[PDB]
Amino acid sequence: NGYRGVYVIKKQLKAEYRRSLSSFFHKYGYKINRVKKPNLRTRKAFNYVQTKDCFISGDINNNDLQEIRTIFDNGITLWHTDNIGNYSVENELR
Amino acid sequence: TKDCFISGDINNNDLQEIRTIFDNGITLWHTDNIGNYSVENELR
Amino acid sequence: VPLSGTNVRILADVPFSNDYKNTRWFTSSSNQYNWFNSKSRVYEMSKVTFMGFRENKPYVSVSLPIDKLYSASYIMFQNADYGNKWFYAFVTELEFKNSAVTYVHFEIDVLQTWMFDIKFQESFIVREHVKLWNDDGTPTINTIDEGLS
Amino acid sequence: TFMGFRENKPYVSVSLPIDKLYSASYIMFQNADYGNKWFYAFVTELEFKN
């Protein structure tokens, strides 16, 4: 029946789950779980950012500074174009 | 029930209260001996 | 959202509430108006002023006994200064002020009021109703784990 | 001049009828003490006093 040698079978998830996960990643990026400085303006259209216990300093009354930490700890989307909310765009790097 | 739907000519406030009552669970009695669970409680 | 109204109408028998679990969706404002216009008018005023003042207690004074306004469920009104736009609101509570004068409390129905001004953008959909059957009679593919026995 | 004083709810007096500002959403201004720095703010509520 012609079975000899070695076979390489390549597999990927179904269309339904590709659509599902791709759309989630497009809007909310990836799970990172790193302590590092955040990516604020690396994409052409928008950057989603969610931190935990973030550190932010500056010449700011601590009250406003605390509010700002809270904002990033809750997650926020930073837009780099005037078309705010339009997620159809590619949102490629740079 | 859970998230029950109930309509009627009722101010929505009372209607909301009634939905809540069924969402929390309630026993509807059909005899005067309220609370007596010894009975057979057969169909019909 | 205005604090003085024209063409004010208090309606009976509007079947949804500020729980916002249900609403009647419309394809146009004209259709929306026609639907509300077929409701019984419990009371009407040509020109009136709204109070509250304090947040969350907005209301309109009506010259009827509180028993006569029990059927009241909804309010619609226009504002002379923003054209032919209709504002819609739930009647939330009747407050007895004087006899022969009730304070009718209301809360802007944000769905009905802004129905055609809202633009929905891409969102995480937890549940929705989807296409069930292909043209050829085959089922569509929906296999997301429902977690129901 | 800004008000909201002791009331702790800041606001600015405008000489327009409340209907003239229904589209208002945001405020920006400079301060003599902070150079050419711009301050930005949400409009949260229109109050009819006069």
Curated annotation (Swiss-Prot), chain B:
Annotated protein name in UniProt: Tail knob protein gp9
Subunit structure: Homohexamer; forms a hexameric tube structure with six flexible hydrophobic loops.
Function: Distal (knob) tail protein that plugs the end of the tube before DNA ejection and forms a channel perforating the host membrane during ejection.
Gene: 9
Residues of the full protein shown: 556 to 599 of 599
Subcellular location, record wording: Virion
UniProtKB/Swiss-Prot annotation, chain C:
Domain of life according to the entry: Viruses
Localization: Virion
Function summary: Distal (knob) tail protein that plugs the end of the tube before DNA ejection and forms a channel perforating the host membrane during ejection.
Subunit annotation: Homohexamer; forms a hexameric tube structure with six flexible hydrophobic loops.
UniProt-recorded name of the protein: Tail knob protein gp9
Record organism: Bacillus phage phi29 (Bacteriophage phi-29)
Highest classification ranks of the organism: Viruses, Duplodnaviria, Heunggongvirae, Uroviricota, Caudoviricetes
Residue range from the parent sequence: 4 to 152 of 599
UniProtKB/Swiss-Prot annotation, chain D:
Signal sequence annotation: none
Subcellular location: Virion
Function field: Distal (knob) tail protein that plugs the end of the tube before DNA ejection and forms a channel perforating the host membrane during ejection.
Quaternary assembly: Homohexamer; forms a hexameric tube structure with six flexible hydrophobic loops.
Protein name listed in UniProt: Tail knob protein gp9
Source organism: Bacillus phage phi29 (Bacteriophage phi-29)
Gene designation per UniProt: 9
Residues of the full protein shown: 52 to 101 of 599
